[PDB]
Write a protein that binds this DNA or RNA. Structure first.
Ligand SMILES: Nc1ccn([C@H]2CC[C@@H](COP(=O)(O)OP(=O)(O)OP(=O)(O)O)O2)c(=O)n1
Ligand SMILES: [Mg+2]
Ligand SMILES: [Mg+2]
Ligand code: NA
Length: 336
DNA sequence: AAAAA
DNA sequence: TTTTTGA
DNA sequence: AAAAAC
């Protein structure tokens, strides 16, 4: 009776994936298209994977794909092949491809993205040992930290670790802004058991423009004094690596944790929370829906109505969804 | 690569 | 067909 | 001074 929407923001996606055989293969094909600079094909496989993640049952025949959007002929051929023998020949070929294997291995280092991974591959590098020991290569400060804390950063962050980090963030923040509201965002807010990092949104109802600007500098200087700041890059947001002492979590005695902090003006806290909760696919479809379906412009700071020529205010995520004409999707339902 | 224009 | 695809 | 980091 009700048709599944092509937009992740109009679907409820919980962590209960009944189609991991299909979505793990589609995620690999998407990743390969990203690497081959085929943005369009990458996005089409990411949307197909996203829609299957929303299904309340596993696909067991081609009839089960009827009425599902984002599944064109190429995607249906991949699903048909997996139904046939439990494997994707297309995803198998990508997993065995030398360029794909090198890109996965190289980008697993913090500070190494698509361009540096492509550069190293075209130079003839295939292993991290050969890259690290090379006498000609020059590494960014980010990459140096990425190699130094590699084992800790490649292991993912669990909930006891995320909670321990939350305590450290809150303790540091209230020291400089006692009325500040600190919220854990990202995957952990969506109910995830693990993550590659821990993200936080910080806002204060009484802080000045200058106080708001200085908070991230004060909090990171405090941690630098404590010898807990392993890496720091302040852009308002900051990308950090913190030293998490084992005793704080309920070998070396500590673990390197990737932490991101975002500071926003109090009146924009709902837009920032919505943008930083994710998932990435849910955020893209929210913005795409706003543009193509409502003629609205949405970002982490505001919502603008082009037709009415007015900014739309929101004190909560629920008010953003209502402005967009969308049913409210809970954070644990945004795992698109 | 799929959907809309 | 061509444009769009988050920003 | 492009890249990585959302
Ligand atoms: N390309 C991206 C990446 C992130 N975000 C927003 C939504 C997710 C939030 C967190 O970024 P990440 O930490 O990379 O996302 P993650 O969802 O938390 O996954 P993980 O738990 O593995 O970190 O920032 C976004 O809009 N676009
Ligand atoms: Mg995260
Ligand atoms: Mg992040
Ligand atoms: Na990386």
């Amino acid at each position: 009776v009700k048709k599944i929407s092509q937009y992740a923001c109009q679907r409820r996606t919980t962590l209960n994936n009944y189609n991991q055989l299909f979505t793990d293969a589609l995620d690999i094909l998407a990743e390969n298209d990203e690497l081959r600079e085929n943005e369009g094909s990458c996005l089409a496989f990411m949307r197909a994977s996203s829609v299957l993640k929303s299904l309340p049952f596993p696909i067991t025949s081609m009839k089960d794909t009827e009425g599902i959007p984002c599944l064109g002929d190429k995607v249906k051929s991949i699903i048909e092949g997996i139904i046939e023998d439990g494997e994707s020949s297309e995803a198998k070929a990508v997993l065995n491809d030398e360029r794909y294997k090198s890109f996965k291995l190289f980008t697993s280092v913090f500070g190494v993205g698509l361009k540096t991974a492509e550069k190293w591959f075209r130079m003839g590098f295939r292993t991290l040992s050969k890259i690290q020991s090379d006498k000609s290569l020059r590494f960014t400060q980010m990459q140096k930290a990425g190699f130094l804390y590699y084992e800790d950063l490649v292991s993912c962050v669990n909930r006891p670790e995320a909670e321990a980090v939350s305590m450290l963030v809150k303790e540091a923040v209230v020291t400089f802004l006692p009325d500040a509201l600190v919220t854990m965002t990202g995957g952990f807010r969506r109910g995830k058991m693990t993550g590659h990092d821990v993200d936080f949104l910080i806002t204060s109802p009484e802080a000045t423009e200058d106080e708001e600007q200085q908070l991230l500098h004060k909090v990171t200087d405090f941690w630098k004094q404590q010898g807990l700041l392993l890496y720091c890059d302040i852009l308002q947001k900051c990308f950090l690596i913190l030293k998490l002492d084992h005793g704080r979590v309920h070998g070396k005695g500590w673990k390197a944790i990737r932490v991101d902090l975002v500071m926003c003006p109090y009146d924009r806290r709902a837009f920032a929370l919505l943008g930083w909760t994710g998932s990435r696919q849910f955020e893209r479809d929210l913005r795409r829906y706003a543009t193509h379906e409502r003629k609205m412009m949405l970002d982490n700071h505001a919502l603008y109505d082009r037709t009415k020529r007015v900014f739309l205010e929101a004190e909560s995520e629920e008010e953003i969804f209502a402005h967009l004409g969308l049913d409210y999707i809970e954070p644990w339902e945004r795992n698109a």
